[PDB]
Amino acid sequence: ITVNTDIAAVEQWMIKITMHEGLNIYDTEGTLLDLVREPILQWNLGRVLTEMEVRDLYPEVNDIKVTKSPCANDVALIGFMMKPSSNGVFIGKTISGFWTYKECIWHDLTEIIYAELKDEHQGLTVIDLVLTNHFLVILTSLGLYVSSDLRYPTTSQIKLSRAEFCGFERVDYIRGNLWYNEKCFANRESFEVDYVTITFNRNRTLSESSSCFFSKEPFLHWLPCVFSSIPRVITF
Amino acid sequence: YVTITFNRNRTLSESSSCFFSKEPFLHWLPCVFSSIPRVITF
Amino acid sequence: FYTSDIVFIVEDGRILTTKAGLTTYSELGILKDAIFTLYYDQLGYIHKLTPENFDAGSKLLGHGNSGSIFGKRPDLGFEAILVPQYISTNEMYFFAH
Amino acid sequence: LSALMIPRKGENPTPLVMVSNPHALGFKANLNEFGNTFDGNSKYKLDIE
Amino acid sequence: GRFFQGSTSIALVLWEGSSKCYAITLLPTIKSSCSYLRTMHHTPGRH
Amino acid sequence: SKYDKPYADPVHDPTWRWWQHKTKDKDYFFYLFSNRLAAEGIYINMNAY
Amino acid sequence: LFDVGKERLVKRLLPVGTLMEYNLPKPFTVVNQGNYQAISFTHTCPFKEI
Numbered sequence: 001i002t003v004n005t006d007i008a009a010v011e012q013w014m015i016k017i018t019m020h021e022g023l024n025i026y027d028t029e030g031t032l033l034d035l036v037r038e039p040i041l042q043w044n045l046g047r048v049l050t051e052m053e054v055r056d057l058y059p060e061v062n063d064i065k066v067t068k069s070p071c072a073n074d075v076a077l078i079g080f081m082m083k084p085s086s087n088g089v090f091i092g093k094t095i096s097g098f099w100t101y102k103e104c105i106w107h108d109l110t111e112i113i114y115a116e117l118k119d120e121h122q123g124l125t126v127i128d129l130v131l132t133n134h135f136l137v138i139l140t141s142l143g144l145y146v147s148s149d150l151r152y153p154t155t156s157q158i159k160l161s162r163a164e165f166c167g168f169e170r171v172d173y174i175r176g177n178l179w180y181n182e183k184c185f186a187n188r189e190s191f192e193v194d195y196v197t198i199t200f201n202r203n204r205t206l207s208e209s210s211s212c213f214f215s216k217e218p219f220l221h222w223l224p225c226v227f228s229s230i231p232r233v234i235t236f
Numbered sequence: 237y238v239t240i241t242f243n244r245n246r247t248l249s250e251s252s253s254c255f256f257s258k259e260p261f262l263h264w265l266p267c268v269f270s271s272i273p274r275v276i277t278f
Numbered sequence: 279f280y281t282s283d284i285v286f287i288v289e290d291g292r293i294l295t296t297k298a299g300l301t302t303y304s305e306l307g308i309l310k311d312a313i314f315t316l317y318y319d320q321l322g323y324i325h326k327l328t329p330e331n332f333d334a335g336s337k338l339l340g341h342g343n344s345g346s347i348f349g350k351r352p353d354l355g356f357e358a359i360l361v362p363q364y365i366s367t368n369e370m371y372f373f374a375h
Numbered sequence: 376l377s378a379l380m381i382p383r384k385g386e387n388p389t390p391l392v393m394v395s396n397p398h399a400l401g402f403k404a405n406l407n408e409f410g411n412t413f414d415g416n417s418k419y420k421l422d423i424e
Numbered sequence: 425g426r427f428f429q430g431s432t433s434i435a436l437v438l439w440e441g442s443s444k445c446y447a448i449t450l451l452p453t454i455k456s457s458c459s460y461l462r463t464m465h466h467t468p469g470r471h
Numbered sequence: 472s473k474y475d476k477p478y479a480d481p482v483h484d485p486t487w488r489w490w491q492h493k494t495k496d497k498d499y500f501f502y503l504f505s506n507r508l509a510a511e512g513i514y515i516n517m518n519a520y
Numbered sequence: 521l522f523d524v525g526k527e528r529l530v531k532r533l534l535p536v537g538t539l540m541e542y543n544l545p546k547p548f549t550v551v552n553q554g555n556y557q558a559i560s561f562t563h564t565c566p567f568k569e570i
């Protein structure tokens with residue numbers, strides 16, 4: 001099937017079982033997924049929550065978000081948005097496309113996301129999250145975080161970098177969306193470049209006059225989407 | 237050196253209200269690094 | 279991206295569906311759960327995701343049917359008086375009163 | 376060898392080729408559609424090698 | 425292609441068809457690059 | 472309208488006389504067009520006429 | 521067309537086949553199907569297709 005065994009974005013495979021090839025009679029469809037080349041699977045997302053540790057969380061859940069991992073589906077991440085009464089970042093992982101509830105292993109990322117903060121503030125929930133072909137972006141209640149990368153496993157634990165947004169407090173990050181074009185880049189042609197847009201609902205304060213930013217592939221420089229009554233950018 | 241002092245709530249974006257800079261006033265760095273007493277003057 | 283299916287969720291619990299590039303749509307049904315979301319896998323099957331509920335559908339076909347979770351295909355008709363009227367051998371008008 | 380098959384109008388029959396002695400006779404069969412009749416049904420040509 | 429340069433998508437839509445059919449839209453992609461199998465070899469003739 | 476001559480050309484299709492002394496070298500015209508180094512960026516094809 | 525705002529001289533197709541098909545009053549029968557009654561128009565063209 002495959003002769004290369006690095007870490008890269010490789011598509012899934014569609015499997016057809018038949019009783020004969022040319023005279024196709026009893027067709028049955030299915031999926032086959034590679035494990036050793038999938039980017040996201042090689043890292044540990046965080047501390048594993050056990051059973052009956054997620055059951056008490058249920059009367060606190062407020063909304064559900066999912067990812068898709070554009071090149072190969074069925075390896076989605078499911079994120080919980082929760083009430084401000086409870087605390088923690090709660091993400092489950094699938095590898096079989098949510099066919100059984102027993103397989104969605106639940107993690108928690110509170111330690112990793114509190115590391116680059118210098119102090120715990122109040123309590124945080126995941127607002128939105130996307131999974132690009134080589135990066136993971138999470139807009140949580142306390143700001144925006146970008147994973148370092150997925151193709152170079154070094155510590156078996158995701159290292160998040162906190163994006164900077166001057167003048168942005170908690171009541172802005174709870175109203176903000178991430179937009180991304182779901183396109184698969186399997187063999188990685190040179191012209192293919194990925195973008196991510198973030199949009200807030202703000203008042204155009206003194207510190208920042210924009211409400212809409214976008215960034216290229218290593219999500220480090222976030223530049224405003226509008227340059228030099230005034231309309232609002234719903235989506236760029 | 238020049239010091240600048242504010243009166244803030246220690247928000248999410250910024251944790252300091254006391255900065256200072258050298259003769260080229262381009263790199264303004266906080267005066268105190270890592271209940272919390274407020275610094276009136278540094 | 280398989281089967282080119284698109285599904286919108288609208289408050290009051292309704293679910294609208296279409297294919298990509300078509301200029302018409304349909305109403306798959308209704309769903310009144312408090313917190314839920316819809317997911318499409320690689321083969322095209324649709325799953326309802328809820329805390330402690332990952333449902334896939336009662337009736338499953340070989341291909342990727344997108345209406346398995348809902349019970350019966352709903353009646354799209356309203357309540358009015360229809361007056362029919364012939365115009366040809368195989369064509370007919372209906373007037374809503 | 377070659378055979379021709381026309382199915383019913385709405386049904387979907389699946390043909391099959393079998394060998395009495397598979398220990399000493401192997402085959403490969405290809406079923407391809409060619410033409411379409413006047414009424415609307417489609418002729419199928421299946422060739423066995 | 426036109427000349428020396430990307431990618432594009434070709435969409436085939438059956439506008440008349442119903443929304444309960446399994447396959448309606450077909451989306452080939454055409455890339456103005458070379459595949460990973462496009463190589464050139466030189467047989468030495470010795471074997 | 473000029474093909475009314477009473478002397479038989481070796482080939483039909485009177486555009487053969489047009490595209491005969493230049494048709495040996497279509498590839499160079501194509502190379503000059505593809506890398507946009509020629510004329511007004513105009514590629515005059517040989518089989519379009 | 522004498523209509524106010526569009527008083528103008530226009531040329532227009534006259535679909536004779538469509539008019540002939542839209543000529544409605546034709547012999548029919550009250551045929552019994554599905555333990556009910558339907559209006560089935562008698563076939564006048566001797567052939568089905570050409």
Ligand SMILES: *[C@@H]1O[C@H](CO)[C@@H](O[C@@H]2O[C@H](CO)[C@@H](O[C@@H]3O[C@H](CO[C@@H]4O[C@H](CO)[C@@H](O)[C@H](O[C@@H]5O[C@H](CO)[C@@H](O)[C@H](O)[C@@H]5O)[C@@H]4O)[C@@H](O)[C@H](O[C@@H]4O[C@H](CO)[C@@H](O)[C@H](O)[C@@H]4O[C@@H]4O[C@H](CO)[C@@H](O)[C@H](O)[C@@H]4O)[C@@H]3O)[C@H](O)[C@H]2NC(C)=O)[C@H](O)[C@H]1NC(C)=O
Pocket residue numbers: 001002003004010011012186187460461463
């Ligand atoms: C859908 O799924 C299919 C499943 O097959 C998948 O096809 C696979 O795509 C891969 C690319 O993503 C292909 O990998 C490529 O393999 C090339 C070598 O092919 C050789 O073919 C020989 C005869 O068939 C075979 O004997 C040979 O055996 C192998 O040799 C390897 C050493 O070359 C060795 O490591 C193996 O263990 C095995 O012995 C090969 O199979 C490679 O040339 C190609 O590119 C190289 O990649 C490596 C790693 O990054 C790199 O170090 C190396 O320099 C090459 O990079 C570039 O090569 C080009 C030449 O091609 C140079 O010009 C550049 O300068 C670079 O140097 C790559 O690894 C794989 O072969 C293929 N599967 C099969 C069965 O063929 C599709 O891609 C999937 N598609 C989608 C959209 O998902």
Ligand SMILES: *[C@@H]1O[C@H](CO)[C@@H](O)[C@H](O)[C@H]1NC(C)=O
Pocket residue numbers: 201202203
């Ligand atoms: C802008 O400010 C007004 C009052 O100052 C506030 O009501 C409004 O919500 C603000 N806009 C947004 C998008 O929050």
Ligand SMILES: *[C@@H]1O[C@H](CO)[C@@H](O)[C@H](O)[C@H]1NC(C)=O
Pocket residue numbers: 243244245
């Ligand atoms: C901090 O916040 C409290 C209430 O939110 C306010 O009363 C106080 O003035 C703030 N501190 C400063 C220095 O403004």
